[PDB]
Symmetry: D2
Subunit: 235 residues, 4 copies
């Protein structure tokens, strides 16, 4: 009955919330992010309050060697994984002619290459377990926004990447999670922004994920798009 979920970008925001939600269902957790202090704090709480096993380890998804070491340590700790949540991501918002090389490169390294690295590192394991890879892209993985050129392009790329992984690995389930705006640290912000300004809360997203992950193993949830009623419905 014991299942193992790996979560990237677990130190805050959506990733943290998903960790907390899956802990409620008794998942063992492997948490990765650059802020190891945050991971430790979350881990100790979940271990004691939810009675689950938690492993955490430094992870920078922009670095090939970091992802490889992280996956090695996770697989060593738990054996094969059942769920991989490739959630780490970031956004800089500027007109395309104003966006810097540095900003564009960072979004590519995390939102696209980071996802690719995360999924390929755990792919053999998921194939064995008929597991589930959930990737947090964005509602903008299939639409456009002004000032979003760099960010949006990487999320469109991530959507193609996930679907290609799916075609190439029909023994694994790939789940594209497409939230609208969420009240996190995303975009250089901080949590505490009211729903009415057009924000979902991370715990809401995490509850949607948790209950969908309760579906039988032969159900493949491929796409979920959800936004605040206070976010204008744009396509």
């Amino acid at each position: 009955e014991m299942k193992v979920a790996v979560i990237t970008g677990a130190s805050r925001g959506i990733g943290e919330a998903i960790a907390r939600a899956l802990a409620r269902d008794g998942y063992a957790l492997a948490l990765g992010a650059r802020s190891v202090d945050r991971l430790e704090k979350i881990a100790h709480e979940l271990m004691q309050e939810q009675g689950v096993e938690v492993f955490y380890h430094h992870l920078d998804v922009s670095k090939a060697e970091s992802v490889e070491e992280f996956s090695k340590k996770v697989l060593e700790r738990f054996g094969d994984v059942d769920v991989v949540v490739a959630n780490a991501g970031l956004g800089y918002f500027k007109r395309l002619e104003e966006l810097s090389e540095e900003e564009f490169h960072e979004m590519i390294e995390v939102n696209l290459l980071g996802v690719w690295r995360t999924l390929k590192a755990f792919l053999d394991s998921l194939k064995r377990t008929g597991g589930l890879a959930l990737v947090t892209t964005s509602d903008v993985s299939a639409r456009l926004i002004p000032y979003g050129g760099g960010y949006v392009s990487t999320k469109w790329a991530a959507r193609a990447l996930v679907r290609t992984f799916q075609i190439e690995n029909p023994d694994v389930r790939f789940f594209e999670l497409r939230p609208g705006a969420v009240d996190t640290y995303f975009g250089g912000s901080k949590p505490g922004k009211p729903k009415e300004k057009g924000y979902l809360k991370p715990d809401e997203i995490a509850e949607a994920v948790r209950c969908l992950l309760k579906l039988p193993k032969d159900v493949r949830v491929e796409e979920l798009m959800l936004r605040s009623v206070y976010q204008r419905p744009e396509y």
Copy 2:
């Protein structure tokens, strides 16, 4: 705390399963389909076993006057509705040059116009309650299949219709439900087909819907696509 859900195509298949799932969460239900015998049977069971209120009434979504009378009777019974599940649908599968006028027309009347009629009939009510309209389209609302020309075209139309309703009514939540193949009577079949042949089971879809409908009222689930792991992942 009492919420009311209206379900079309409630006599069997996905619609019936959604009715049963929402009954578990204590929804009052208004059931519509052409098979009133089936509706009565389902209703009596849910009333006694789940302790919910159930109203049922003949509904043929291919007829404007039937949908109008159905909505009148439902609103009279319950007052305003909180959830409307526009689920009735059907498919004939033939090469486009073989598909008959009759077959194409029926799919249009149910899959597209039936959805339109259902949503407009309850639209004022949903606007008042900040309610949720869930439309069962199909995974093929955004992809193509051979032999599916007539059916697919109506589901593409239904997707545009739902999104347009959403743009035009930002005070209402519209949820496009996109199942792959499901083991029902759909396509001239009968339930009992094994998952391994590439079928989801209706109760699985209904559980996904039920737990998503538990999200707070200010969360707008816009799209969910899910299929059997035994269905080839095609886009």
Copy 3:
């Protein structure tokens, strides 16, 4: 060297313009629309001024029997056809709850079923000639507009229909033509509206089509989307 093009909605607007453009390249033409007076007028002019053969015949694409008789007469006149332009279409623009049954039905009968009827009637002929079926859908075959629910849904359907025809008939070339707003009689208007209000001119669209149709027979133009620089770029 003599090629035959069939054009529906040839009495005015884009269809007329395409007829005129193809006449410049020496196509024999078969023209269909309900306004036979208009067809005769266009035909006599093109015959004398462009030296091409022109056949015209009453065609109401909303009626199965009309399309069948039209195709019979065209094939009798010319033998097999090389190009079929399924261009007839219309739009009513209203919020979805205001759109009438009559309006929605007419758009379905012309924009979707009319296209289906036109293509299936000439399909065997095009298969023999490795011919080209061009369907005038709209830029809104893949996007949404307020007030466009009925119209847009039929164009989304038409796009699925065309692509399905293509999959099912890889020996024929299918070309989806997606103009933005064009200065015609479309939408209850009349020609003469200035480009600056956001309109392409029919002769511009027709020139784009004509020069693309000059490509070798083994080139399959599948999609062309074009709009006025004065139309806001929306996706």
Copy 4:
């Protein structure tokens, strides 16, 4: 009457063919690629045979400083430009778990960032001239192929990028060119492959582009997708 077209990836393949086609219409040309020997050869021929002005200069679109110097030299040579063809691109084809960091990075640098750099470098100029930016993406900018994960993801990104440029700069025309397979050096191949194996020829693509570029300045061709009849129609 004299117009100036800048073409990247002009040393061979589609870029070269576009240069030759636009020369036939009397465009002055600015050619960029890494193979300056090839550019010189093409330039001398077009100058003498087509009587057009041709400027060429080393360009590596994977390097920010190269694109900036190239644009500086082009604008110095000609003044403002009327057409910018961002065509340079490449593909490596492997399952996603086999694709190397090096391969993925190169495709990103050329297919996505190279396009971004090219367009932003000439953006002020195009804004002044109400010019046209044509980007050669691919038919796979909106579909998936096995072994294409890295390549496809960059083309999906490029499509989002182009559309975002368009939204942000409605005074400029952006044209997404989406060829299927073409007989070039693409994919580590060489020209000479027969059409029947599923290849368009570069001169065909270039003719499609040339005749569309003859449309009046207030016509905005946004998308053209074309493939060989010998390429299976996939979406």
